[PDB]
Amino acid sequence: MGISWLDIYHVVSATVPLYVSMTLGFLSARHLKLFSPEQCAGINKFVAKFSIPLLSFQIISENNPFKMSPKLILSDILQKFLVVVVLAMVLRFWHGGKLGWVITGLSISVLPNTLILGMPILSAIYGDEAASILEQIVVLQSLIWYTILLFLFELNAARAGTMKILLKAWRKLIINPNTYATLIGIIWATLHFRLGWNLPEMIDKSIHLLSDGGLGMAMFSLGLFMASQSSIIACGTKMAIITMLLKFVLGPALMIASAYCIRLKSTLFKVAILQAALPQGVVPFVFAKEYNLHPEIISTGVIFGMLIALPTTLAYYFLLDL
Template sequence: MISGADFYHVMTAMVPLYVAMFLAYCSVKWWKIFSPEQCSGINRFVALFAVPLLSFHFISSNDPYAMNFHFIAADSLQKMIILVALALWSNLTRRGSLEWTITLFSLSTLPNTLVMGIPLLKGMWHVAMPAIIAKSISILSDAGLGMAMFSLGLFMALQPRIIACGKSTAAFAMGVRFFVGPAVMAAASIVVGLRGTLLHIAIVQAALPQGIVPFVFAKEYNVHPDILSTGVIFGMLIALPFTLVYYILLGL
């Protein structure tokens, strides 16, 4: 069972994110430090520099030979199933659209781990990144997550209400995030042969809160940023009880 120390570790990861978001919210809502144009500039910096370099930093330090390839296959299959289903819905129904396809795909599949092939260079041929390049990347990538949450707080402060997309849409988004994603992940994991603890881990990680990166790009390209901002803000608040329920039900 989860101990008090485990809960504390979760809080030490979550609270700093909300501190960054709260400071950004206050800087616009009450302190009037940033204008809407300046907020857009900050989000553009996050989308074009901080997040890509943060992603590259994690990818380049990853060891592909230490991965569980059944787990990766399950993750990929989950995304393919949802993408095909959304593509059919978008093309065969009047209510479907590219914007909703992107938004629902983000909500249902994107808390998952970035997995790409850059580390193969190091693993196969022992090609190490020069220190000067590594430092050049890390100086900006270290700010990526905090700046993304700061950008979210700025966006939230510019909205007329906290739940920017409305209560019914927010409830729908939470349903997609915490029920549809884990359900499809469970099916995909069983298909590729995951069993036992790995199957349980796959389901629980699919029920983690909405990733902040999809919001950054939704804001940059104006594709339902209100829904994804609500998904991030309230998803992190309710994610702990949801993941605990999954944890208990799966008997981890």
């Protein structure tokens, strides 16, 4: 069946540390009362300005741009376009600030946590044939989709003529370290994998020194933020259910539609579909907190996702084989 009992344990081992960090952050902010809200904001700003950009640079620079499969990229782009279209259509009939929910909808719908909790799960269920397609997904995710998400965040922030707002958002984006990180990362990937240049050991050691606890500190900030809320389900039960349906019932459905449209055939099809039902991630939450765009919804989604990501992933895996 593939469930075994020595793989769903690998999943739990990969997931538990992210929970230990969140619990430590929450206890520190709530019961121990170490960090004031300003200090928590400073920690989150450090995560968003240094850890995340450096991790994105590493991810982009450690993958060959000339080996990425065009079909996978087309499928990912089509999924993102479809989710944008459906969210825009929904926000017209039902619901002021409409762009804010689009960013939130995209954050919790088409940005799975493929980096950490998507690697062991999928690598075990299908082997190494799924441990080289989830890096093509993660690199594309970081570069293209975090650049676009940051542009949308800046545009929304500037909103509160028309070319003035776009110009202001673009000007604030070029100063954003994430853009520089992604651009330098892709340039270095091209150079390394075409001309063979190797990064000097000093620079690699410096980057690995300053951006090694990025995931742990991100979880710490995410746990700090839930110390400032009244309940674990900050948004509410009704909104939490929608947050789950937007991540495990809509994202996977749009990914299946995109894969069918692109006609994915080999394990690419199943890995592409089953990686869209993965946990939500924390980078979207980090951005939401930094720009203060419905952080409660994102962070509430992250927890319950990471809880229920195993049963849903196994259900999708059983469905696919059928």
